Amino acid sequence: QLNELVEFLHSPQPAVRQIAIDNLVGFSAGPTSKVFKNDSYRPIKDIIKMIMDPEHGTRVIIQQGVTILVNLSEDKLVRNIILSDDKKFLKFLVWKIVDLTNPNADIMCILLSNLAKDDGILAVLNIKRNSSGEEVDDGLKLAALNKEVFKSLRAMDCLMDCFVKGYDKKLTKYASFNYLAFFFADISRFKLGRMYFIEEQEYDGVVPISKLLVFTEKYDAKVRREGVASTIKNSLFDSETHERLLKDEKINLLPYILLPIASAKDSEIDEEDMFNLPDELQLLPEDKERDPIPAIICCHLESILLLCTTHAGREYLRDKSVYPLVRELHKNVENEDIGELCYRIVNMLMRGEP
User: Fold this and answer.
1) Phi first, then psi: what are they for 295, rounded to 5°?
2) Breaks in the chain follow which residues, C to N over 2.5 Å?
3) How many of the other CB atoms lie within 10 Å of CB of 59?
4) Is 286 exposed, middle or buried (CB count within 10 Å of its CB: 0-12, 13-18, 19+)?
5) DSSP code per residue over 180-213
6) 142 - beta bridge partners?
């Protein structure tokens, strides 16, 4: 019955396809979503084709198709089809996200973050275009880049720009790009993805991880705080990079890891210890409080714990009064998980040189 309806997704007639997807989008959330996997995931492939169609891919059809893909993207076998069956779709997806006229950019960011669970997403690191004007690439009509906003020709650089500059609808009335945080979080799990965030990029000469740090304190957007916290943690996977990253003053990593676990009230720290805190941790507002979400805090402690792997790192953290900060977190926040991590950090800061 639904089997009959999905087949019309590859009808030759646009108006039939339109009626088909309009009636199917509702059935893509529940148990009934098995129908989209018929005939070796033919309906998925059809929907992907409808979305990319320059002529018949209207605003509504794109919104419906992407909504379907988002729902089905929970299944890993579907994510395979979306990424590997047709390589154009990923190119289509990332470039339509940076098109600041696209009203479906946000819901597409969600799809992108879901696809980032599979290592096939690493293809985004190589996606580039030849010029910033309206261009044809492998049969795709790429819209022209906003040259004022986007100085790069690489997609990863443009997605970064959208995230960093596009919060609170500063670039588009349609999107804030919050879920690109989860995209960065998931892609940074992979080695090649981690290498993007901790290495200086040519197009603007900065290490990308530094551009994310400011959102650690954005308390009206927990998705951005969650994603950024994980991205920092993943970026610190290799301990041989820690000395470089901690001591690079134009990155300035540590203060933005510590601010979320710092509080103005309830925290008792000596004048002597307070003098050794980073500048940003000094003279805090009186209403300054810790991140209320424990999972985010734990993620930050995991990062601090990673930075305790190396003697040079531990020396740096001890010199910046990380121990008093972790002590007062342990005292004032009764949560078992946070507590465990606090004493794990102290265990590491306790040991000397090997």
Assistant:
1) -65, -35
2) none
3) 10
4) exposed
5) HHHHHHHHTTSHHHHHHHTS--TTT-S-GGGGTG
6) 135
